[PDB]
Coordinates of C-alpha atoms (C1' of nucleotides) and ligand atoms in Angstrom, one line a residue:
Chain A
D17 CA -28.5 15.6 1.4
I18 CA -25.2 16.2 3.1
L19 CA -25.0 15.5 6.9
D20 CA -21.4 15.6 8.1
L21 CA -17.8 15.4 6.8
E22 CA -18.2 11.7 5.9
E23 CA -21.1 12.3 3.6
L24 CA -19.4 15.1 1.8
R25 CA -16.5 12.7 1.6
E26 CA -18.4 10.1 -0.4
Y27 CA -20.0 12.8 -2.5
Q28 CA -16.4 13.8 -3.4
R29 CA -15.0 10.4 -4.1
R30 CA -17.9 9.5 -6.3
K31 CA -17.5 12.6 -8.4
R32 CA -13.7 12.3 -8.7
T33 CA -13.9 8.7 -9.8
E34 CA -16.6 9.5 -12.4
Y35 CA -15.0 12.6 -13.9
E36 CA -11.5 11.4 -14.0
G37 CA -12.9 8.4 -15.7
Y38 CA -14.3 10.7 -18.4
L39 CA -10.9 12.5 -18.6
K40 CA -9.2 9.1 -18.6
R41 CA -10.9 8.2 -21.8
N42 CA -10.7 11.7 -23.5
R43 CA -7.5 13.6 -22.8
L44 CA -9.2 16.2 -25.0
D45 CA -12.6 17.7 -24.3
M46 CA -11.1 20.7 -22.5
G47 CA -14.4 21.9 -21.2
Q48 CA -14.4 18.8 -19.0
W49 CA -11.1 19.8 -17.5
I50 CA -12.6 23.2 -16.9
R51 CA -15.8 22.0 -15.2
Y52 CA -13.9 19.5 -13.1
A53 CA -11.6 22.3 -12.0
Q54 CA -14.7 24.3 -11.1
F55 CA -16.1 21.6 -8.9
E56 CA -12.7 21.3 -7.3
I57 CA -12.9 25.0 -6.4
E58 CA -16.4 24.6 -5.0
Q59 CA -14.9 22.1 -2.5
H60 CA -12.8 24.9 -1.1
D61 CA -9.7 22.8 -1.8
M62 CA -7.2 24.8 -3.9
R63 CA -4.1 22.5 -4.0
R64 CA -5.9 19.9 -6.0
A65 CA -7.3 22.7 -8.2
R66 CA -3.8 23.9 -8.9
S67 CA -2.6 20.5 -9.9
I68 CA -5.7 19.7 -12.0
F69 CA -5.1 22.9 -14.0
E70 CA -1.3 22.1 -14.3
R71 CA -2.1 18.7 -15.8
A72 CA -4.8 20.4 -17.9
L73 CA -1.9 22.6 -19.3
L74 CA 0.4 19.7 -20.0
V75 CA -2.4 18.4 -22.3
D76 CA -2.5 21.6 -24.3
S77 CA -0.8 24.9 -23.7
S78 CA -2.2 26.6 -26.8
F79 CA -5.7 26.9 -25.4
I80 CA -5.8 30.2 -23.6
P81 CA -9.1 30.2 -21.8
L82 CA -7.6 27.6 -19.6
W83 CA -4.8 30.0 -18.8
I84 CA -7.3 32.7 -18.0
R85 CA -9.5 30.6 -15.9
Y86 CA -6.4 29.3 -14.1
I87 CA -5.7 33.0 -13.4
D88 CA -9.2 33.8 -12.1
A89 CA -9.2 30.6 -10.1
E90 CA -6.2 32.2 -8.3
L91 CA -7.7 35.6 -8.0
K92 CA -11.3 34.7 -7.0
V93 CA -9.7 33.1 -3.9
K94 CA -8.1 36.5 -3.3
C95 CA -4.5 35.1 -3.5
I96 CA -2.3 37.1 -5.8
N97 CA 1.3 35.9 -5.9
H98 CA 0.2 32.7 -7.6
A99 CA -1.7 34.9 -10.1
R100 CA 1.7 36.5 -10.7
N101 CA 4.0 33.5 -11.1
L102 CA 1.3 32.2 -13.4
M103 CA 1.7 35.3 -15.4
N104 CA 5.5 35.1 -15.7
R105 CA 5.1 31.6 -17.0
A106 CA 2.2 32.8 -19.2
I107 CA 3.6 35.7 -21.2
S108 CA 6.9 33.9 -21.4
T109 CA 5.1 30.9 -22.7
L110 CA 3.0 32.9 -25.2
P111 CA 4.3 36.4 -25.9
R112 CA 2.4 36.5 -29.2
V113 CA -1.1 36.5 -27.7
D114 CA -2.5 39.7 -26.4
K115 CA -5.0 38.6 -23.8
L116 CA -2.3 37.5 -21.4
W117 CA -0.4 40.8 -21.5
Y118 CA -3.6 42.8 -21.1
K119 CA -4.9 40.7 -18.3
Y120 CA -1.7 40.9 -16.4
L121 CA -1.8 44.6 -16.9
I122 CA -5.3 45.1 -15.5
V123 CA -4.3 42.9 -12.6
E124 CA -1.6 45.5 -12.0
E125 CA -3.8 48.5 -12.5
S126 CA -6.6 47.5 -10.1
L127 CA -3.7 47.1 -7.7
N128 CA -2.5 50.6 -8.8
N129 CA 1.0 49.3 -8.8
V130 CA 2.8 51.2 -11.5
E131 CA 6.5 50.1 -11.4
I132 CA 5.3 46.8 -12.8
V133 CA 3.2 48.2 -15.6
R134 CA 6.1 50.5 -16.6
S135 CA 8.6 47.7 -16.8
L136 CA 5.9 45.4 -18.2
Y137 CA 5.1 47.6 -21.2
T138 CA 8.8 48.1 -21.5
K139 CA 9.1 44.4 -22.4
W140 CA 5.8 44.1 -24.2
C141 CA 7.0 46.9 -26.4
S142 CA 10.6 45.8 -26.7
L143 CA 9.5 42.7 -28.7
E144 CA 8.1 44.8 -31.6
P145 CA 4.6 43.6 -31.0
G146 CA 2.5 45.9 -33.1
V147 CA 0.5 49.1 -33.0
Chain B
rG9 C1' 46.4 -38.3 10.4
rU10 C1' 50.7 -39.0 7.0
rU11 C1' 55.6 -38.0 6.3
rC12 C1' 60.8 -35.8 7.2
rG13 C1' 64.0 -34.9 11.1
rC14 C1' 66.0 -34.4 16.2
rG15 C1' 66.4 -35.7 21.4
rA16 C1' 65.2 -39.2 25.4
rA17 C1' 64.2 -44.1 27.2
rG18 C1' 63.7 -49.3 26.1
rU19 C1' 64.9 -53.2 22.4
rA20 C1' 68.9 -53.1 20.4
rA21 C1' 74.1 -52.8 17.8
rC22 C1' 72.6 -48.1 14.1
rC23 C1' 67.8 -51.2 14.1
rC24 C1' 62.0 -52.5 16.4
rU25 C1' 59.0 -49.9 20.1
rU26 C1' 57.3 -45.9 23.3
rC27 C1' 57.6 -40.7 25.0
rG28 C1' 58.6 -35.5 23.9
rU29 C1' 59.6 -31.7 20.5
rG30 C1' 60.7 -29.0 15.5
rG31 C1' 59.2 -28.9 10.4
rA32 C1' 56.0 -29.9 6.2
rC33 C1' 51.6 -31.7 4.3
rA34 C1' 45.7 -30.0 4.9
rU35 C1' 43.0 -23.8 5.6
rU36 C1' 36.7 -20.1 6.5
rU37 C1' 30.3 -23.8 4.1
rG38 C1' 25.2 -21.6 3.7
rG39 C1' 21.1 -17.9 3.7
rU40 C1' 16.8 -12.4 -0.9
rC41 C1' 14.3 -17.9 1.9
rA42 C1' 11.9 -19.7 10.1
rA43 C1' 7.5 -24.3 10.7
rU44 C1' -0.4 -23.7 8.7
rU45 C1' -4.6 -18.9 11.5
rU46 C1' -2.7 -12.2 11.5
rG47 C1' 1.5 -9.6 4.5
rA48 C1' -2.5 -11.4 0.6
rA49 C1' -4.6 -17.4 -5.9
rA50 C1' -8.9 -17.6 -8.4
rC51 C1' -13.6 -20.0 -8.9
rA52 C1' -18.0 -22.0 -7.1
rA53 C1' -22.9 -21.3 -4.4
rU54 C1' -27.1 -17.8 -2.9
rA55 C1' -29.9 -13.6 -4.7
rC56 C1' -30.6 -9.8 -8.6
rA57 C1' -31.0 -10.1 -13.9
rG58 C1' -30.0 -12.7 -18.3
rA59 C1' -26.5 -10.6 -25.7
rG60 C1' -24.2 -2.9 -29.8
rA61 C1' -25.6 -0.6 -33.8
rU62 C1' -32.8 -1.0 -35.0
rG63 C1' -39.0 -0.2 -34.8
rA64 C1' -37.0 -5.8 -34.4
rU65 C1' -33.2 -10.2 -35.1
rC66 C1' -28.3 -11.2 -36.3
rA67 C1' -22.4 -11.0 -39.2
rG68 C1' -18.9 -8.2 -38.1
rC69 C1' -13.8 -5.0 -38.2
rA70 C1' -11.8 -1.0 -35.8
rG71 C1' -10.9 3.4 -32.4
rU72 C1' -9.2 5.5 -26.6
rU73 C1' -8.2 3.5 -21.5
rC74 C1' -3.7 4.5 -15.0
rC75 C1' -8.8 -2.6 -17.3
rC76 C1' -7.3 -6.9 -18.8
rC77 C1' -8.3 -12.8 -19.7
rU78 C1' -6.9 -17.4 -23.0
rG79 C1' -3.4 -18.3 -26.4
rC80 C1' 3.9 -20.1 -28.4
rA81 C1' 2.5 -15.7 -30.6
rU82 C1' 3.8 -9.5 -34.2
rA83 C1' -2.3 -15.3 -35.1
rA84 C1' -7.1 -15.3 -33.3
rG85 C1' -10.6 -15.4 -29.8
rG86 C1' -12.8 -13.7 -24.9
rA87 C1' -21.0 -10.4 -26.0
rU88 C1' -18.1 -7.0 -32.5
rG89 C1' -13.8 -8.8 -24.8
rA90 C1' -15.2 -5.1 -21.1
rA91 C1' -15.4 0.3 -19.9
rC92 C1' -17.5 4.7 -23.8
rC93 C1' -23.7 6.1 -24.0
rG94 C1' -23.2 10.6 -19.1
rU95 C1' -23.0 15.8 -16.7
rU96 C1' -22.3 20.8 -19.8
rU97 C1' -22.4 29.1 -19.3
rU98 C1' -17.2 34.0 -19.6
rA99 C1' -10.9 35.5 -25.2
rC100 C1' -16.9 38.4 -24.7
rA101 C1' -17.8 43.1 -27.4
rA102 C1' -20.2 46.9 -30.4
rA103 C1' -24.7 50.3 -31.6
rG104 C1' -29.6 51.8 -30.3
rA105 C1' -33.8 52.7 -26.5
rG106 C1' -36.0 53.7 -21.4
rA107 C1' -35.4 54.3 -15.6
rU108 C1' -31.8 56.0 -11.7
rU109 C1' -27.5 59.1 -9.7
rU110 C1' -23.9 63.0 -10.3
rA111 C1' -19.9 67.0 -12.1
Ligands
LIG24 MG1 -11.1 -9.1 -30.9
LIG25 MG1 -23.3 -10.3 -31.1
LIG26 MG1 -13.5 -4.2 -29.2

RNA sequence: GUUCGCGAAGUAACCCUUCGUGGACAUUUGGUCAAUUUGAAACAAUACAGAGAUGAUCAGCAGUUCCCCUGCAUAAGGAUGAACCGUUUUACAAAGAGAUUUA
């Protein structure tokens, strides 16, 4: 299969042309955006992955699992701060959904960092969310 | 080059000519751009074939696209214009049962 950089290169170009064709015809079919992001991670190239998600959000922001996976895409590379900024834009974009708040929480508990989860629940309570 | 005027010389008798000088008249074009190979036409020819819905042979309208072509066109054609026909795993839990480890 692959020999050197140049063969990997053509194996990328071919995929990108193909997929972004299939995204070019359907702006929808979110699973396609997901899968294509996943490929983009397996190429160990993040920057493109970040973009590809961002665009995937500008298509639809009300589909959470793309939020989530665009978190875990930042964490599984063991880079946190992006998985923070993403969370500020997330809960601020969707206060009414729970899974964002809970996930940002757990991210701050497995880091043990309390000052956050204090101030955090201070907000997430202060909005009269529910029981 | 014209004209007004002055001075000088000559002709002269207030002029005809020549020289010098003052003044006025007339007053800023064009370039996005160099002259054939190396700052960009597109077809044709060769080879490979040789027309969507079906079991098969055809009429067709659409729909999406960071594809357009012909047409004056908001008409209508261009294979129903072409491309589409593919790759596909996580909001994830609850109850029960066996093996392993530990307070
Ligand atoms: Mg037509
Ligand atoms: Mg036909
Ligand atoms: Mg058509």
